[PDB]
Structures are given as structure tokens and as C-alpha cells.
Design a protein around this ligand. Structure first.
Ligand SMILES: c1cc(CNc2ccc3c(c2)OCCO3)ccn1
Ligand SMILES: Cc1cc(C(=O)Nc2ccncc2)c(C)o1
Ligand SMILES: CNCc1ccc(Oc2cccnc2)o1
Length: 330
């Protein structure tokens, strides 16, 4: 089997991407944030505290003839940015782009933090990291990909995120029309539960490539590119007026600037992020200071190849017996 679904930016800055997902019988379609950095499929629901729902579409398990309470199971998750959610668990039929899993754990939110309530466009998350990170207790649950894998034509999914435009998540096949050149595959460590790999270096604009190993994770659920402070300083030093602002929480730059590109290495291959992908617009409405899309990972504890990086590439998440990651230009 295969599946193919379009993923769409939630706003004009590509702050996150939503993909329609069918849950239950008859189908209830919710727009979920596919997150290769976490491993829980959770949704706003008829159980979510009413004051914490503000425009989201909710899953109502009592209206699904295939929903079953997973008795005694609870979940609770906190993401790197301070947001969080928690609740109980159902199993139900879940379909993405024509690919169906029966008995998928659908984690129903009883509580969500304020930034989830504030994102009316995001009805929940669909985790695509390794199932060892799933938070369901006392019986840990598998991701949608993990459950689908044996039925797929090939044990893979691909992320093809757009810049200011829709893109695609495919399951079970590699669309050879969606990228240019060849796909370069690179080793993955699953020891922390992430799609963790080592980039071979970077360049800023037209500058010479610096060969240096940068461990990090491929994370579709993180907006920005978070890299070591040395790398980030070298980037922003090429932008007149750019500075790290403690009050804003990162590097800012004059909105009048045209930004240089940023290249990262994948083996001997190179992925080029155009400068415009690094512009996250005014720090507050009407400001002429703009927020940078490359930020320091110092204090995160891990480097994160988030949407800013991934949307410059066609990315293969290869879930073969030994997982690997593939990157192609597009
Ligand atoms: C990246 C972007 C966002 C939301 N967008 C956004 C845009 C500009 C900003 C911002 C946030 O926060 C800092 C000030 O400037 C949230 C998380 N990562
Ligand atoms: C500003 C913001 C970020 C998030 C958010 O969900 N973070 C996030 C970060 C990493 N992985 C998954 C999710 C929210 C609700 O608001
Ligand atoms: C959470 N409300 C503020 C807001 C609007 C857009 C964004 O940015 C997001 C949202 C979700 C995930 N990652 C980044 O934050």
C-alpha cells in the first residue's frame, strides 16, 4: 500500500504545516501537524477542556463506530518550546492520503497549553519519530508509520515541504519526479528516539564550504534551523545590522536586508537554503526588525534541522531494519 497527502503552511511565514487526516467511522477529518521529532498522535477532542478549544476541529470518539477506549491508558507530552498537552487514549481507524491503519492509538486531549489553544489551524499532532518516544502509559503505543510499515510497498515516508506553498507527505514510495539529481543517504542513530544524523558541514552565501560534523535531528515539527552558536554567528555576521537580542530571544536583522543563503552538507552532497527562507518577518506587527530563521541551539541540547532546512530538500525517512535519512535537492 501507499498514501499521499498534501501538507499546507498554516500562515504566511510557514510557521508550521497541516495535513488532513481521517479518523474514525464515519471519517472525522482533522488537520494535524506531522512531527518527525515526536511520537504521539494526539487530537483536540470532545474531551478537551472547553475553555481551551478556540476554533479547532475536534475528534468525537462517541460518534465513531470503530472507536474503542484504551482502558487505563493516559498520555502527557511537553515539547521543546514549552507547549504541552495530555489526556486519555482511544484506538480507531486512521487514514492519511488513502493509507489506512486500523487500531491506531488516537490520544484524546483533556488539557492543552495556551499556545495550542491559540493555534486555531492545528487540530493536533501526528508523531513520526521512533515509537520509543511515545508517551502513552502504562502500555506504550506505536506511531502511525510504525503501524503502517509492514503493509507499505517500501518501509519509508517522505517529506516535501513547500516554501510559501503546499507540499506533500508520501508513505510507502519515493516519487522520483519530486526531486532533482540523486538522493544522498546518511546514517541515523535511533538511540534518542529521533531521526538523528550528522551533517558534514556548511557554507554561508557564496562562501567556501566548512567541513565539520554537526549532529542533529530532522524535525518537521520545529519551525526553524537550530545550529551551534559558532555556525549561527558566522551566518549572521554576513548580514549588516544583525544582532542577537536577549529581549526578543534570538537573532534579529533589519527587515530591509536581503539574506544570504545557507548550505548544509549531506555526505558529499549539498542542500542550499535560499536566503528568503530564513526571513521570519517583523518581530511585532509593524516593526522594522525581523526575526531570523537560523538560531542557536545552545541551551537546547541538540541541533535541529527544522522546517527552514527540510523545506529546501526532498527528505526520505527510511524505516528499513537499519533506518537512514535521504536528502535530495528539488
Ligand atoms: C518560529 C516562528 C514562530 C512564530 N513566528 C514568529 C515570527 C517572528 C517572531 C517570532 C515568531 O518570535 C520572535 C519574534 O519574531 C514560532 C516558532 N518558531
Ligand atoms: C509557538 C508554538 C510552537 C508550538 C508547538 O507545537 N511546538 C512544537 C515544537 C516542536 N515539536 C512539536 C511542537 C506551539 C503550540 O506554539
Ligand atoms: C501559538 N500561537 C502563535 C503562533 C502562530 C504561529 C506560530 O508558530 C508555530 C505554531 C505551531 C508550531 N510551530 C510554530 O505560533
Amino acid at each position: 500500500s501507499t498514501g499521499s497527502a498534501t501538507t499546507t503552511p498554516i500562515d504566511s511565514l510557514d510557521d508550521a504545516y497541516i495535513t488532513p487526516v481521517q479518523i474514525g467511522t464515519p471519517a472525522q477529518t482533522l488537520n494535524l501537524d506531522f512531527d518527525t521529532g515526536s511520537s504521539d498522535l494526539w487530537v483536540f477532542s470532545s474531551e478537551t477542556t472547553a475553555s481551551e478549544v478556540d476554533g479547532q476541529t475536534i475528534y468525537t470518539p462517541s460518534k465513531s463506530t470503530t472507536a474503542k477506549l484504551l482502558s487505563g491508558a493516559t498520555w502527557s507530552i511537553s515539547y521543546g518550546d514549552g507547549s504541552s498537552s495530555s489526556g486519555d487514549v482511544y484506538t480507531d481507524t486512521v487514514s492519511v492520503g488513502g493509507l489506512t491503519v486500523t487500531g491506531q492509538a488516537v490520544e484524546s486531549a483533556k488539557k492543552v497549553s495556551s499556545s495550542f489553544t491559540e493555534d486555531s489551524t492545528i487540530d493536533g499532532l501526528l508523531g513520526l519519530a521512533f515509537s520509543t518516544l511515545n508517551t502513552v502509559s502504562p502500555t506504550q503505543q506505536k506511531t502511525f508509520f510504525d503501524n503502517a510499515k509492514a503493509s507499505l510497498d517500501s518501509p519509508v515516508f517522505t517529506a516535501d515541504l513547500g516554501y510559501h506553498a503546499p507540499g506533500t507527505y508520501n508513505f510507502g514510495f519515493i516519487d522520483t519526479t519530486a526531486y532533482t539529481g540523486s538522493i544522498t543517504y546518511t546514517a541515523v542513530s535511533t538511540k534518542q528516539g529521533f531521526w538523528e544524523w550528522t551533517s558534514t558541514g556548511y557554507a554561508v552565501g557564496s562562501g567556501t564550504f566548512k567541513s565539520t560534523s554537526i549532529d542533529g535531528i530532522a524535525d518537521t515539527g520545529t519551525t526553524l534551523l537550530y545550529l551551534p552558536a559558532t555556525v549561527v554567528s558566522a551566518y549572521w555576521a554576513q548580514v549588516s545590522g544583525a544582532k542577537s537580542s536577549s529581549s526578543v530571544g534570538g537573532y534579529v536583522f533589519p527587515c530591509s536586508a536581503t539574506l544570504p543563503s545557507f548550505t548544509f552538507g549531506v555526505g558529499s552532497a549539498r542542500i542550499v537554503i535560499p536566503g528568503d527562507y530564513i526571513d521570519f518577518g517583523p518581530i511585532s506587527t509593524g516593526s522594522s526588525s525581523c526575526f531570523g530563521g537560523i538560531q542557536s541551539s545552545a541551551g537546547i541540547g541538540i541541533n535541529i534541522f527544522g522546517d527552514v532546512a527540510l523545506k529546501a530538500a526532498f527528505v526520505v525517512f527510511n524505516g528499513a531494519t537499519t533506518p537512514t535519512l535521504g536528502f535530495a535537492s528539488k
